[PDB]
Symmetry: C3
Subunit: 112 residues, 3 copies
């Protein structure tokens, strides 16, 4: 099992969710983050230090998938979330050691 | 060491925290997320596309525990966070490669 | 590749970001969390149960770095985020199985 974490442009959430649904992915968890990178927000200089005054929101998508699914999922997300412009974001894949569905106590692949 | 990530119903946070305290777990980190899954929010259809108009908040609990603790922790959380109804959520266990307490520089199990 | 996750005092974000920039780290992702631990917020007791009425915000910094960088990054963060007072937070290092830059499709170390 793999945890697929994608940091994407907020306006790409709907498109990514449809891609996952097409693969029959049953659910996912989403949170708000701020992004720092080559694309930067505006700053105001005070005493030699530049205070950030604008920020770039991103959406963090976390979806647990089986090993047999993960490559297809990463592919779908990349294609859905791509604009070709700077700031498009990242996909990080983390190994999951165990998964449990709280409602049933089902483990691993049967928990998703 | 393991990072135990639980996605739970917001009204179950207090109950989960008490369970962890009973195990002598010293601390944990909590964030707000939105959940998508078999339980769905309401949508409004515009031009063939259904815009989500209601969302289902969940709370993401992240607690780092020692290998000797992790199975007990996962068990406690599952029992505390369970309602038996759809939407109860998931527990994902991730391996931790290193941990540091910022205040002391203590490493691994002594950092918790 | 490693995902370095740091839970830090909010007023330490600027200092940590400068440390990473000094190492030539190109970007990072930041989110808001609440912290529970030895430092606690205030509570109000109702029917034997203590409702939390104040909370301690922390900032979660997540930065993916190469294996050759990770020890230096963990060191920089620890020194930047340290106050010596309780509540300073934690750094957890997670192994990354794969990384992709969404804009280019570049993989692993070339994605950062
Ligand atoms: N090393 C990193 N670790 C974690 N998140 C990162 C890292 N580098 C970039 N990001 C995230 O990716 C987003 C886009 O990065 P950026 O460098 O602006 O564009 P691109 O990803 O197109 O090269 C950033 O806003 C940040 O959220
Ligand atoms: N594959 C997944 N990866 C990450 N989070 C998930 C996944 N599937 C479900 N979730 C999270 O679990 C929550 C509950 O899932 P749901 O399918 O509604 O009910 P149940 O977990 O009882 O089957 C969702 O709101 C979502 O936050
Ligand atoms: N086992 C843990 N897993 C995840 N986060 C933790 C854990 N223990 C502490 N934390 C986080 O670290 C923060 C500081 O912890 P605390 O015990 O108050 O001080 P210190 O880290 O200086 O010992 C907490 O507010 C919480 O966010």
């Amino acid at each position: 099992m793999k945890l697929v974490m994608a940091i994407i442009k907020p306006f790409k959430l709907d498109e990514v969710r449809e891609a996952l649904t097409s693969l029959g992915i049953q659910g996912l968890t989403v949170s708000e983050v701020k992004g720092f990178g080559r694309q930067k927000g505006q700053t105001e200089i005070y005493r030699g230090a530049e205070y950030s005054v604008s920020f770039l929101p991103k959406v963090k998508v976390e979806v647990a998938v089986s090993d047999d699914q993960y490559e297809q999922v990463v592919e779908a997300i990349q294609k859905a979330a791509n604009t070709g412009r700077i700031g498009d974001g990242k996909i990080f894949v983390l190994d999951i050691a165990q998964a449990v569905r709280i409602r049933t106590g089902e483990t691993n692949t049967e928990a998703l």
